Amino acid sequence: IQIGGLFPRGADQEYSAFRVGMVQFSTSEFRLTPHIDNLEVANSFAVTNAFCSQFSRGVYAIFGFYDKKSVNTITSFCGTLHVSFITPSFPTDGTHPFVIQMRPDLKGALLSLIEYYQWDKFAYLYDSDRGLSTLQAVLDSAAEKKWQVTAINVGNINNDKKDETYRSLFQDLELKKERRVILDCERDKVNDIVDQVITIGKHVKGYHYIIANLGFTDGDLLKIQFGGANVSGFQIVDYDDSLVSKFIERWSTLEEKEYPGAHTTTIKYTSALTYDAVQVMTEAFRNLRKQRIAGDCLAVPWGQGVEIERALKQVQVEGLSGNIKFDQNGKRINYTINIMELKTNGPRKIGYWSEVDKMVVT
Amino acid sequence: SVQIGGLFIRNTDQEYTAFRLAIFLHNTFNLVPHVDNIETANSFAVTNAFCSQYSRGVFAIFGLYDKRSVHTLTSFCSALHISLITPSFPTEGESQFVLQLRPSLRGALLSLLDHYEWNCFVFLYDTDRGYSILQAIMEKAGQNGWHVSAICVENFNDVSYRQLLEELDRRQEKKFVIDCEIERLQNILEQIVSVGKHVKGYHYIIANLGFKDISLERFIHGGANVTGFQLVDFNTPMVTKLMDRWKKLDQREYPGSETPPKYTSALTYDGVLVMAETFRNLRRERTLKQVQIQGLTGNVQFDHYGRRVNYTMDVFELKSTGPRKVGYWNDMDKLVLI
Numbered sequence: 198i199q200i201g202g203l204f205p206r207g208a209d210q211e212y213s214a215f216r217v218g219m220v221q222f223s224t225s226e227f228r229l230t231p232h233i234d235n236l237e238v239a240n241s242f243a244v245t246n247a248f249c250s251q252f253s254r255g256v257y258a259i260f261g262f263y264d265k266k267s268v269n270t271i272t273s274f275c276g277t278l279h280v281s282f283i284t285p286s287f288p289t290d291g292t293h294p295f296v297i298q299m300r301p302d303l304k305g306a307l308l309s310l311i312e313y314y315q316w317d318k319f320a321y322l323y324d325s326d327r328g329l330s331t332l333q334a335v336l337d338s339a340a341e342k343k344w345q346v347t348a349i350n351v352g353n354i355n356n357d358k359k360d361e362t363y364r365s366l367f368q369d370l371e372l373k374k375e376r377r378v379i380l381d382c383e384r385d386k387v388n389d390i391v392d393q394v395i396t397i398g399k400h401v402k403g404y405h406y407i408i409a410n411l412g413f414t415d416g417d418l419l420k421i422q423f424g425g426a427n428v429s430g431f432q433i434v435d436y437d438d439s440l441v442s443k444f445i446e447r448w449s450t451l452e453e454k455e456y457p458g459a460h461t462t463t464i465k466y467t468s469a470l471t472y473d474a475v476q477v478m479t480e481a482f483r484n485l486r487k488q489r490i491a492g493d494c495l496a497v498p499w500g501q502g503v504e505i506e507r508a509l510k511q512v513q514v515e516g517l518s519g520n521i522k523f524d525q526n527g528k529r530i531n532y533t534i535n536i537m538e539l540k541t542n543g544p545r546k547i548g549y550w551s552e553v554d555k556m557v558v559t
Numbered sequence: 560s561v562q563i564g565g566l567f568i569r570n571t572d573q574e575y576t577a578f579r580l581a582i583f584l585h586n587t588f589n590l591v592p593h594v595d596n597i598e599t600a601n602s603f604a605v606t607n608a609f610c611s612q613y614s615r616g617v618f619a620i621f622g623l624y625d626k627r628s629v630h631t632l633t634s635f636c637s638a639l640h641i642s643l644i645t646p647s648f649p650t651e652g653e654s655q656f657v658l659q660l661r662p663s664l665r666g667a668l669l670s671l672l673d674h675y676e677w678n679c680f681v682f683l684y685d686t687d688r689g690y691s692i693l694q695a696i697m698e699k700a701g702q703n704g705w706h707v708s709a710i711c712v713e714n715f716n717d718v719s720y721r722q723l724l725e726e727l728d729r730r731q732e733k734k735f736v737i738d739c740e741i742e743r744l745q746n747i748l749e750q751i752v753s754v755g756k757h758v759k760g761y762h763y764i765i766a767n768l769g770f771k772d773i774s775l776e777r778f779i780h781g782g783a784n785v786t787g788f789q790l791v792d793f794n795t796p797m798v799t800k801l802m803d804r805w806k807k808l809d810q811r812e813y814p815g816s817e818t819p820p821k822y823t824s825a826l827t828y829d830g831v832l833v834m835a836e837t838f839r840n841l842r843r844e845r846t847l848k849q850v851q852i853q854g855l856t857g858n859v860q861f862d863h864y865g866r867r868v869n870y871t872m873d874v875f876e877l878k879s880t881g882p883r884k885v886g887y888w889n890d891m892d893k894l895v896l897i
């Protein structure tokens with residue numbers, strides 16, 4: 198058994214979580230081979246070269262990341278070759294087969310908390326790197342329900358004038374008398390945005406700030422805490438269950454000399470998705486061995502397309518993210534997302550979002 | 560060779576760095592330092608160190624003291640007829656054989672509060688530099704019928720600071736006057752932002768000589784009015800020459816060669832220059848007090864009690880583009896505005 202990897206540059210916590218998942222899920226009966234690579238997912242040529250190199254040595258399954266400018270290439274290559282590609286990246290739009298997806302969809306929850314809080318005429322600050330897949334839904338919902346959106350494109354900003362531009366955005370919104378904004382950017386961006394918020398002020402009472410990036414316990418809220426402004430967010434990894442407590446008990450023990458990181462109390466959601474991917478993949482091959490069951494990329498399907506794809510897509514397990522069970526397409530179907538809000542005290546649970554019931558308050 | 564004594568305490572590493580800089584550059588009548596650094600500034604260790612320095616033989620001691628150990632050091636210096644040049648906080652009353660380089664901030668602060676014409680404000684203070692400022696403020700408030708709420712913040716933690724700030728927010732004060740140490744002032748400034756008071760409507764008065772030595776960029780962007788004092792002049796070619804030569808030395812022995820000097824470093828350098836002038840004049844106590852020199856902090860001259868006279872200090876206000884000088888304070892001409 199061999200299982201490759203196309204992990205991106207600038208990411209080290211994810212690969213540390215990957216090796217920790219390798220160590221934790223001990224398998225004497227069979228052992229896989231990582232053969233990990235490293236490159237910039239934003240460049241298509243390197244991605245194609247690495248994919249071809251992995252395919253040239255008969256890898257059974259590949260596991261890596263991508264972005265908006267490289268998802269189509271991966272999807273097209275995996276469709277023709279029947280090689281499954283497990284990814285904790287953003288959910289793709291449309292039925293793309295043979296791409297197992299291990300991230301819940303933010304959409305639907307941001308539209309169920311924006312109505313539990315009865316609002317209208319809100320502000321929305323989107324980024325043009327993740328993709329125009331969440332803003333479009335917001336525009337559609339606003340058109341359907343007569344809401345008024347004020348879209349602002351954060352990102353694609355020069356670092357020299359990043360402070361000035363971010364400050365000027367809030368200064369301009371002050372003129373229009375807008376007090377509700379919806380921030381949805383990666384941790385690096387949202388940290389800078391909230392820092393500039395605090396620099397201008399706006400952390401006094403009378404302002405409500407939703408973070409729409411899952412997580413919400415890894416953006417250093419200590420700066421924005423102990424103020425008057427409201428803070429609300431979504432969370433996927435609850436930090437009080439038996440499994441997560443057992444994980445964090447051994448998380449701090451390992452040192453950064455061999456395993457980078459692993460000394461802080463909180464872990465990013467992407468690394469948790471990677472660690473759960475390790476388990477769901479090992480158990481997927483376990484089920485096949487219980488059932489007793491290549492040339493160049495520029496050349497025919499290989500031996501076992503369905504035997505691997507359907508087996509990996511029919512898994513039912515429980516991990517840090519919660520229930521893990523995939524539907525026909527490969528997206529999560531039985532996921533629950535915790536609702537949290539920030540007070541003078543740390544984050545407190547407010548409810549949960551699920552498919553079976555729209556919105557729950559507790 | 561002329562023997563000099565050096566006494567320093569903890570958390571004053573830049574003081575020792577400036578002293579070593581002054582000694583090195585002045586000698587390169589070579590001075591002979593007798594530095595004996597002490598960790599805790601208590602009476603017993605200071606007395607023992609002074610005894611050792613005196614027994615080895617010293618003509619003048621440059622030392623630093625705090626509230627607790629000032630009395631013993633001054634008493635022994637007056638008793639043994641050994642001149643002591645110090646940059647610490649000035650004392651009150653008659654004092655002999657003690658030279659003090661730090662000017663008193665009482666007059667300038669009183670003139671500033673007179674200029675803005677305030678009748679109710681909050682005064683945050685600590686007792687690390689005596690009770691002179693608090694007593695002067697209370698006397699002036701009693702004479703002029705003011706309303707001051709002095710609060711001691713010596714033993715306050717973050718929770719206490721935030722709760723006190725919220726309680727003072729409940730009342731309408733809107734005007735604060737801070738007088739504490741550098742670290743305490745930094746803590747106050749980093750916890751006043753979290754509450755959200757770095758906004759237009761408040762007017763803080765930083766009462767020290769290090770207005771440009773602290774980072775106020777957050778207040779600059781906020782727009783809240785801030786007024787402070789400055790003693791060291793940066794456009795003089797003398798300070799630029801000294802600072803460039805500081806850059807030309809290594810950083811493994813003289814750290815701080817990347818920033819303009821604070822008030823204490825300039826004070827120590829001026830004290831070293833005054834002491835060297837005193838020795839050179841003596842080559843050809845009474846002679847010590849007759850010195851008149853041009854140091855980094857301007858004109859240096861002392862009266863019969865060793866206090867500063869004929870000293871100029873600029874007053875700065877925080878604007879959108881940064882600090883902007885608005886005038887200067889002098890003893891003979893009081894406050895002068897531009």
Ligand SMILES: *[C@@H]1O[C@H](CO)[C@@H](O)[C@H](O)[C@H]1NC(C)=O
Nearest residue numbers: 376377402403404405426427
């Ligand atoms: C903050 O939360 C409280 C309690 O839910 C709510 O009444 C208030 O309107 C919120 N403020 C803003 C600015 O949304």
